[PDB]
Ligand SMILES: Oc1c(Br)cccc1Br
Ligand SMILES: Oc1c(Br)cccc1Br
């Protein structure tokens with residue numbers, strides 16, 4: 001697999017084509033959060049927050065012995081087990097995605113963490129860096145990234161175009177039990193300050209925050225191929241908790257090396273753009289980053305840092321030309337959210353960032369299918385050529401973290417392929 | 420013949436019954452007696468002769484090594500930056516672990532109820548933790564819970580009936596009103612008792628496990644071979660540390676699954692009871708001279724955690740692949756141990772010191788001597804694990820009829836940082852050994 005990645009390396013430079021209209025995108029505009037898309041009816045006709053309507057459908061399916069919309073389970077017990085696995089997978093994730101910056105798991109400084117307090121006498125986070133050489137730092141941090149659970153890791157200079165103009169967060173002293181009802185919008189700004197810092201008014205990223213480290217966290221193929229049913233939800237959920245652990249582990253390593261580090265999971269900025277600029281894969285018709293190793297069946301998280309690093313090269317292995325003629329995701333999408341048309345610079349709705357050349361999809365149509373189906377769909381990921389019943393999945397092949405030993409050698413790494 | 424870990428486990432499976440041999444002086448063991456916590460062993464001199472809590476003296480040695488550009492005792496690093504990087508990696512690995520081991524029950528990550536967790540609150544409208552179980556068949560439950568366990572990061576998983584002999588008589592914990600920054604100064608003992616109650620509960624005086632708590636699920640969390648082979652130096656400390664955080668994630672993930680199936684679940688990591696005994700009874704491996712559970716897949720180079728539950732399950736069979744007989748003649752760990760903590764003598768039922776639980780046949784090691792080497796070396800040693808022939812990846816051969824151990828196996832850090840790695844430090848050359856189908860999970 002290291003052969004292929006070297007073979008398809010592009011020359012340096014962001015491969016995302018932009019025009020003079022591009023502006024940073026306010027996070028509240030996503031379909032998950034925006035007032036125009038947030039409320040959806042449940043199966044009884046009651047309008048609720050979309051995830052509560054989705055909950056009602058999960059309950060209905062368990063009672064009716066179903067693993068998904070009009071997909072009968074082996075019995076009620078199997079139906080229950082799939083939703084229990086899904087719910088458990090989210091254990092280390094806040095309110096579906098860890099998006100609030102500098103809250104809960106996503107702290108922008110390590111100072112208050114229990115691990116930092118226990119290690120304080122050693123003073124690793126107070127000691128100036130002993131290594132400033134970006135080549136050695138790139139090798140160290142990528143090794144750490146693999147220890148921390150990334151199946152793929154890449155480095156890019158930070159393109160501020162993909163950092164949200166304003167984040168969705170909560171006030172700092174609001175308890176978890178009130179968080180969903182007290183979400184607010186808060187600017188993310190870049191200033192000449194020593195350290196990432198949050199004021200009452202602003203999330204402040206230092207101008208020295210040069211780089212972004214992007215991690216790919218592989219989902220399980222057997223489970224994703226049950227999309228839109230419950231086991232696809234379960235591999236989604238478990239990987240969100242893997243994302244969170246990656247961010248915390250890697251931020252701590254970077255801090256203990258003498259630099260600062262900002263975790264993010266689904267917050268702070270647009271993961272797909274970062275992942276493309278860092279060479280993990282290419283943008284696709286469905287909108288996901290398609291990787292050679294996993295196709296789009298891989299989750300993304302990222303960490304921002306002033307640690308000196310060597311940027312990776314973007315890769316071109318023909319995804320754009322293949323998506324131009326394929327359209328399989330668009331034809332299988334249960335909500336017709338994915339376009340069959342050509343790429344443009346103009347978003348279809350508020351949910352798209354205009355000003356960048358991409359396939360423009362209707363993400364409110366996507367979200368509408370989630371309460372209907374009682375899950376997170378994923379049919380587009382499941383049918384994509386690059387990616388390649390529920391009783392058979394439960395009785396079938398599994399391995400640690402859902403990884404597959406038939407392909408796990410493809411992500412082996414030596415220094416030569418780290419820097 | 421291509422290595423078949425499932426065939427190996429089938430070949431060496433025993434008939435039912437705890438393999439640990441006990442006599443009449445066996446009593447449950449108070450957790451405060453471990454070398455980490457007992458006042459006789461807790462204090463150790465640093466390299467300047469100052470007597471401190473052992474981990475503070477070890478800190479002093481880590482700092483000295485970085486300043487002198489060393490990766491371990493008398494082991495020069497490539498440069499100061501490499502020495503720094505190894506300790507940064509080690510420190511980061513512990514991110515999801517409280518005070519080296521997560522031992523306080525029902526505190527921090529080790530909650531005995533899911534009710535207050537952010538995930539439970541988010542999911543409350545579905546009622547999964549309040550709805551009665553839809554599955555009570557132990558066969559289906561074993562398949563379900565083991566699949567979840569592999570999703571949750573276990574490289575090995577097994578089930579045993581809970582043997583209360585290995586549950587600590589009293590736990591080490593902190594009062595519920597004590598904040599983290601004072602925890603190390605406010606540790607206390609608290610009895611673990613079994614009573615006729617519906618759910619695990621803590622009172623001001625007792626940690627109460629229900630009499631319905633029939634089963635224990637044991638997970639093996641594989642460490643990285645290349646890094647452990649640097650024991651007693653910093654990279655062995657880093658694979659130890661990262662696996663403690665994997666243990667914590669496993670416990671929380673699995674307890675939440677079990678609760679959402681309609682049962683209760685008690686996490687534990689290094690607390691609550693003795694992991695090696697549970698692992699032996701659950702068939703992960705056999706006890707050894709060094710004292711660890713040796714597994715066919717990883718030897719002793721694997722961490723353990725466990726979850727206690729009333730979920731009906733099918734116990735696994737113990738395994739006997741000849742470890743006792745190899746340990747009888749090997750003694751490599753005993754010869755290489757830098758503190759001479761491991762005995763070269765026979766097994767007995769009589770503890771060597773307060774740190775051993777008497778009344779069970781085992782090799783009796785001096786664990787105060789072991790702990791004494793940790794401040795001296797500035798780490799968690801591991802030389803015994805590193806030199807054990809079972810830690811080697813290629814011990815198994817097939818003779819055309821059956822699997823056997825190759826007797827011939829019993830006769831630097833820069834290169835690790837520049838060398839092979841993969842996700843979670845797992846090794847794709849051997850990762851096929853832990854593939855699992857339904858037949859591997861429940862018979
Ligand atoms: O990424 C997600 C977010 Br942010 C919210 C709900 C579900 C998913 Br998947
Ligand atoms: O298992 C451990 C405990 Br409990 C404490 C310190 C170091 C280790 Br390793």
Ligand code: SF4
Pocket residue numbers: 332333334335336337338365366367369376377378379380381
């Ligand atoms: S997740 Fe489902 S509804 Fe959404 S774009 Fe993909 S196929 Fe369509």
Ligand code: SF4
Pocket residue numbers: 284285286287322323324326327328329330380383384385386
């Ligand atoms: S299904 Fe086809 S068009 Fe859609 S993302 Fe995959 S390759 Fe592209």
Ligand code: SF4
Pocket residue numbers: 707708709710745746747749750751752753803806807808809
């Ligand atoms: S080194 Fe030898 S005696 Fe020690 S635990 Fe391993 S096999 Fe047994």
Ligand code: SF4
Pocket residue numbers: 755756757758759760761788789790792799800801802803804
């Ligand atoms: S960890 Fe080190 S000091 Fe302790 S028993 Fe093993 S070899 Fe000896």
